[PDB]
Ligand binder design. Structure first.
Ligand SMILES: Nc1nc2c(ncn2[C@@H]2O[C@H](CO)[C@@H](O)[C@H]2OP(=O)(O)O)c(=O)[nH]1
Length: 106
């Protein structure tokens, strides 16, 4: 994971790692954060060309710390089931429940 910009939000490489890291941890323990359903399967309905193969899991990323439950916000980190970083996606600039890539994800 590297620095990225989702809509207007700038996430540092450390912030992306921490989120990616958390998603992995929970995926591994067959856990979810708080009372949410994250991390959960990310189907890739949008056809992003991730640098790693799937299956994938999505997890929120946000400023101010690692997601713990509640509103996930617009941003997400995507990892595969091998805990390999796939990319960052966002609802910002998208329509409906669609996602668009954050900088570096296409
Ligand atoms: N748009 C979209 N939704 C997905 C995908 N994979 C799973 N979903 C989920 O299917 C619904 C459509 O947006 C939501 O519940 C969404 O999860 P999240 O809202 O947790 O991101 C995907 O690749 N794209």
């Amino acid at each position: 994971q590297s620095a990225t910009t989702c809509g207007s939000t700038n996430y540092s490489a450390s912030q992306v790692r921490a989120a990616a890291n958390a998603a992995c941890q929970y995926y591994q323990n067959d856990d979810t954060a708080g009372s949410s359903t994250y991390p959960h399967t990310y189907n890739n309905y949008e056809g992003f060309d991730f640098p790693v193969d799937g299956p994938y899991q999505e997890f929120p990323i946000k400023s101010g710390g690692v997601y713990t439950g509640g509103s996930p916000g617009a941003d997400r980190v995507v990892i595969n089931t091998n805990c390999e970083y796939a990319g960052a996606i966002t609802h910002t600039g998208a329509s409906g429940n669609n996602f668009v890539g954050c900088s570096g994800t296409n």
